[PDB]
Symmetry: C6
Subunit: 304 residues, 6 copies
């Protein structure tokens, strides 16, 4: 919904947004939104996501797909009427994203998802990309575990020529829904095949804010190196302004650079990861914050 501000009320939104990443207990926003999801009546639609055609599929709080739901309309705070309707397994009226209010007035945040190695990590979409000697898949799994902490992490597998991997985009979105509805740390391996149909374009657009609103983190591996300035510059704009955080490999082997976005109109943070392999290619991230200005973000986007 739309929000109204003056100097004073704006000043305290920023104050609150800063707190959401810098001071709030790690993982606490996810906890709060689980409670908001649990207080929804069974059967009520909570999440709608785009399938391959551009049609949307819809889910309840238990990640059950809704097949039929008679028109229901709420009156939001600004007078706006939200209309939800599912017919023959697809959405007939409504919008992609959260069909319930998780954020209320607290919008434009990067709610902290976890602290690891003395670094705070933001929820939203983290894109693991780059070019060269470093391998992305071992990193998403290693980073998934590390941000998992006490919790197990979810692994969505899509579009790779390996056993068990699903290659259907509609099963893929059905996966992501369940994961965001039920888990704080989600790994997508890989995001390559989506990058383009209507529902695929919708995913790139939508998944960052879905995850950021939930307070869960989606860590996706995206591999370019294509060198086609028709597809490599979509794997550069997606990384640019479609992700909340960005993890990109450097010239030094086993070294990665993290660019976290800390909130609406706040200063993007940076830090560097050192990594090594163990038995069966299992990667470990070692333990033992600078502000990064613009034109340095462009200078890092050397993926050609």
């Amino acid at each position: 919904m739309i929000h109204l501000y003056d100097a004073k009320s704006f000043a305290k939104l920023r104050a609150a947004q800063y707190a959401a990443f810098h001071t709030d207990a790690p993982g606490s926003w996810f906890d709060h939104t689980s409670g908001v999801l649990e207080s929804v009546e069974d059967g009520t639609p909570v999440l709608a996501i785009g399938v391959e055609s551009g049609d949307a599929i819809v889910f309840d709080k238990n990640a059950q797909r809704i097949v039929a739901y008679k028109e229901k309309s709420v009156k939001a705070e600004d007078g706006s009427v939200s209309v939800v309707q599912v017919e023959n397994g697809f959405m007939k009226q409504g919008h992609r994203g959260w069909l319930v209010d998780l954020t209320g007035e607290l919008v434009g945040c990067s709610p902290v998802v976890a602290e690891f190695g003395g670094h705070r990590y933001a929820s939203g979409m983290v894109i693991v990309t780059g070019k060269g000697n470093s391998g992305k898949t071992p990193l998403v799994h290693a980073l998934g575990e590390a941000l998992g902490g006490k919790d197990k992490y979810a692994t969505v597998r899509f579009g790779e020529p390996l056993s068990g991997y699903n290659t259907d985009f509609n099963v893929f979105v059905d996966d992501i829904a369940r994961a965001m509805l039920q888990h704080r740390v989600i790994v997508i391996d890989s995001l390559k095949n989506v990058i383009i149909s209507r529902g695929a374009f919708d995913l790139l657009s939508d998944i960052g804010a879905m995850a950021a609103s939930r307070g869960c983190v989606v860590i996706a591996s995206l591999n370019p190196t294509s060198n086609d300035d028709k597809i490599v510059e979509l794997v550069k704009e997606a990384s640019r302004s479609n992700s909340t955080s960005l993890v990109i490999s450097t010239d030094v082997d086993g070294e990665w650079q993290v660019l976290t976005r800390t909130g609406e109109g706040l200063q993007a943070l940076t830090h560097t990861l050192q990594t090594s392999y163990g038995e069966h290619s299992v990667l470990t991230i070692h333990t033992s914050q600078t502000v990064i200005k613009n034109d340095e973000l462009e200078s890092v986007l050397r993926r050609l």
Copy 2:
């Protein structure tokens, strides 16, 4: 509708158009058009805007979406007839834009929206763009507040990977409608995702004149830096001739250049803004007019 002129009648339109920006009380046109909107019978369609498909949705004076409206026709001065009809939640006959006459004979104006720092600001579409060290989002909010003056400003949030942000284009247009129908200062953050479907192309085309007719200002942040001469030159023609004003960052950090268009066939004004940050990234515009000719507008469009 079409308008007929001779030397004399044309001369006084210009006279009136000049007045609309240079001499009229700031914010006074918005006030006049609120009164025209309030004198419309409830239920009567006042605003129609394009959804993602290219179908149009329609609103009343209270920003309520119309679901069914029997065919009504109105005769003009003039000859021309206007036909309005809403069926099953969508427009069946009519046009995108204002379904009521706000402007009458006073057309081609940039009605002054506010005075700030001794500078008059035009209503219509202001696009905040550029390339480099300067951040757009803190500016649209700072400029929104400043033009707000005594009034709060509206913030439409679209297409960013942050908590609370809506990613559905149809919810987005439903936002803009409400904002223009109810508020003098509107902020859109961000315009990036719209830049392309039919309804998206329609928004760029339509929103400038909708806002200028209302006497409200829509301040949108648009970020290029893509360096793809397929998308960066649509973020150059939209900025060029789809906006009423333009705010673009310079080489000097915290400095911005404002190019106001003062009305149909009148001289575009220019001036420079100095800015600094405070607590939690809250931006302030400092306080303490040259005419800019063509080829200097092209010379400023160095976004490659």
Copy 3:
């Protein structure tokens, strides 16, 4: 319809075509065709024009849109049947353009629309274009007034971010219809937004001949400077062979170059305009004919 010629009958068509521009009373053809329009029975379709989809809308002599019209058939002098039918507000059988014969046997003319500053001006489509320090809008209005002479001129406004401007293409064509049906001098400001859908492509193709057949002049401002060899070369072919006359700005400020096409296979005329501004940006064209060969038309198309 098709026309048959021999040496003798062809020779006198040229004789007549030359007369239509060089010797006939200025504005006299427009007068003749108003009489032909007034001698049409009420309700009978006279003009059909393409809407955005490519469907056509149809008008009577009074610029009233026709909603239902039962199939009527007219036989021509060459044994060809013209079929006209309107159903549910759209054309079901027929053709875009004049649904009545205005020209008879007198075809391929540039009927003189007005004399001003000792120069004859042709009816049809005049495109006001160019690149640099000179402003198009003040010129189309100045030139509109001047060719208006004793008469007021019509001003169609489309696709600019200013108060009152219509941004709907279907309202736009409804404007043009009325204007051509009722006025000798028409101004379109601006043609930029049309330049592409089916109905838009149809307008560029159709409007030149519609206006030339009526003997009314459509003066449209088209602004390129885009520097994209995908859109700037459509604002070069439209100017090239889609307009009857062309008015383009030069290196000298306030100076414009007029290239009139005088008729089917006749010599295109050229001349130069001097202009200055007065109060409130109101432009004046000063008072006090060379034949221009090919390759000099290409040499003038330096809009890159």
Copy 4:
């Protein structure tokens, strides 16, 4: 239909094809096919041509459009069954082109259309093109008259911003049909607007052979000079292998080069035309044959 040959029967086809251009009385094939058209029962479909959508319209021997025609099937010489059916004004079964056999066994000819200035001219599609100081329209009319001889020539007018010109493609094809059905010499002015929809692409493909089969000549003016290697190389392949003859202007003013194709797999002929203007731009071709090999045809296609 398919044709079967051996050395002997092939040798006499070539013998006959050569005769069709080099020795047969000029215009005699057109006369023969008029007789074949006159011996068709009224109402029977003789010609089908593509409209804008790709649907086909159909005509009888008198150039009357057929609206309803019940399925009729003939058995051709090779066993093949030709099926013709018109329903609600459009073809339902059949093919574009001549729905009756005009050629029988005499196929692959360029039947001589006229002799003028001691030069034989072939029927089919003649494309008048080029770049520079020379004007195409005066030439198509001059060449139309000259090949007309004792007969008047037909003038189809399409897609120019002049009075009387039709801009609807469907009226355009309805013109061409009538002209080919009723006249030996046809002029199309101009072919520019067709060069692209389905029905337009169909015209370029189909009209050469339609005219060649009839023994009538279609002289079309096509103007490039666009310098866009997306449209200028379609105005180079159409000229190349979509026309029977080609008339192109040279560096010398008023001089044109004719490249006639004399028949299936025979030697293309060349010759040069000198021209001058008279009163009202009426062009005259002066009076007082070399074989042109390949790579010299490419060397002449200097339209960039």
Copy 5:
């Protein structure tokens, strides 16, 4: 259908494939498959080919088009089932190509079509192409006659601006069907117009194998010289891997280079033709084998 191999069974397929071109009596496979076609019950579909839309038309052994055929299913060796159904003149279930088994277990062959000048020629698609002084049409006819031997050859004429030439793609495919069903040597003049719709793309893909399976030869003339790297590289991949043999002209006038493909995974053969013209452009191929490796096939594809 799928085929299963081991070392031994594979070794004897190659043995048989080699024999099919190198040792079998020229023209003997065509004879065998005529017998297989003659032992099909009347009415039973034998050949299905793609029309312009991508729908398929179907034929019986006598080249009669089938209009209605009730669903018939046949069991294979093998497991696999083949379903054939024709409804309202089009295929409703099935596949493009031979609806009966001509090849059985003998697949991947280039069955010898004829011996001429002491050279064996393969059946399948022969593409006659090149750039320069040499003419393609006289060659396809000369080569058609030579491979015809004791038999007449079929001539399909498509897409040229000459008398009798068909320009409708659907009549074109109806021709090819008949020709392949009834004749060993077929000539297509020309293949230029097909090179693109769905049915056209289908022809290039399908006709090589249709002809190779039948043991008939389709000799098609394809002319590029366009110099557009959007169309000239489709007249380079079609020639490359869409034809069984390739006949291309050299720098020396009247000399052509033949590249025969001798069978699945066997060595492509090469040889050179000398030619001269006689009366009425009738070409003769003179009388009085090297293996060509890869990179020499690319080195010959100099058509730019």
Copy 6:
């Protein structure tokens, strides 16, 4: 379905994945999944694959195409419902790929398909590609036989101008289904024609994982050498990240380089093959492992 991990459970997945390629008996996974297929009730859908339109066709354990199957629903271990439905010969609800669980919890493997010449070969998609003197077809058959070992191999033939070859994409996918359902070693000759419609794009995406999940190997020959950076870079990304293994020819004649992918996030293996020809072009691979890092995979992709 989605999978949940911690440090410990992830560590043993890698342990298991490594085992699946490095230590498990060659061909043993294929054996296991045949048992899982045999324990499915007759009629139950097991495999769904995309036809040309993007619709899916469905098969039972015996490779019989399913025509009608009433909606059946199965619950997973993670609370997700799989819905399968076939109506009028096409899938109405479900997903492309295996409609039964073959992999359970053992996902992201490259199950070893065979050992040959002391080298383990992975199942999945092997693409045989390259540029130059070496021939692909003899290799896919040689490699097919060698990995076949004690078993015969299946040969799917598609899109080549040779006798017996199928050119219909729908018959093609029907082949692949049967082959994967019934055989451990499959050869596709060739993949060229698929490389683009919806169903074709789906095959590239889907076939790698289908085969890897089955534990069968699909060896496909793909030939580029096109030198068009619109099609050659799709024959570079398909080879890159759409195949499990890659076999590419080198500068030395008869020598090939094998790049095996050993499993999800494990080290890709490399080795070199020496080959020679025998009688009738039958190729033999000679008998008498290094880890290949990134940037060396790019350095090998020199196919321009």
